[PDB]
């Protein structure tokens, strides 16, 4: 997208979202990042939404194919699962490459740095979902390390109701439960996150209250499923 204006890439990313053309949206936002300027709050959200939808479709397809493959145990099911898996890993690597070159190192504010580090943890988590051996442990540790640095910053720099802080804790708790085989850590994090947000709700406006309570409900839903 080197020949397209940064502003046009952003405008077209928004159009692609309206058209539910998430592959296009991701390519447009990738081009915008590669312009080399930092991303605004809105622009970060566009980047996140685009790639979340793309990898979301790949993860759903991988789970369908992995389930069929396990029930069978010709080479076709394995071959096709491998093809989808390789495409998913390529998208994760692309996102991680954008964060490493050079979104994270230029992110100084808590809101941007926590956002990117949460992304880093998420896409290593997606890699961990399909990983098996020799690399699964290192991939899991890469996810944990990114989430942990994001947690440390968010606890120091953000109120307990901040939606980025809440969504980071939600996803880190999912990492603990689904990836790290640490369901007690997952439950403890979700509970402490929920309780500390509840005690901070009195400080919020009507609109901020709606934003925070929506994510607290997601924490509650998980606790209900896990306990």
């Amino acid at each position: 997208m080197g020949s397209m204006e940064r502003a046009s890439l952003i405008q077209k990313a928004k159009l692609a979202e309206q058209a539910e053309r998430y592959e296009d949206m991701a390519a447009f936002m990738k081009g915008a990042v590669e312009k080399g300027e930092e991303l605004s709050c809105e622009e970060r959200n566009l980047l996140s939404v685009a790639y979340k939808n793309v990898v979301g479709g790949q993860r759903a397809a991988w789970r369908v194919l992995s389930s069929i493959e396990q029930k069978s145990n010709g080479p076709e099911v394995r071959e096709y699962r491998e093809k989808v898996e390789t495409e998913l890993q390529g998208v994760c690597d692309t996102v991680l490459g954008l964060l490493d070159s050079h979104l994270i190192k230029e992110a100084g504010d808590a809101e941007s740095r926590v956002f990117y580090l949460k992304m880093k943890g998420d896409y290593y988590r997606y890699l961990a979902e399909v990983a098996t051996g020799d690399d699964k442990k290192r991939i899991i540790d890469s996810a944990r390390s990114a989430y942990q640095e994001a947690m440390d910053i968010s606890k120091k720099e953000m109120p307990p109701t901040n939606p980025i802080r809440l969504g980071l804790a939600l996803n880190f708790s999912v990492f603990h439960y689904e990836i790290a085989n640490s369901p007690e850590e997952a439950i403890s994090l979700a509970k402490t996150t929920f309780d500390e947000a509840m005690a901070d709700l009195h400080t919020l406006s009507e609109d901020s209250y709606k934003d925070s309570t929506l994510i607290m409900q997601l924490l509650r839903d998980n606790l209900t499923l896990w306990t």
């Binding site: 939404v49 979301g56 939600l170 996803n171 999912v174 997601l218």
Partner: peptide
């Protein structure tokens, strides 16, 4: 177990 949907906006 649900992560942040994050698919809209």
């Amino acid at each position: 177990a649900g992560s942040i949907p994050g698919r809209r906006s």
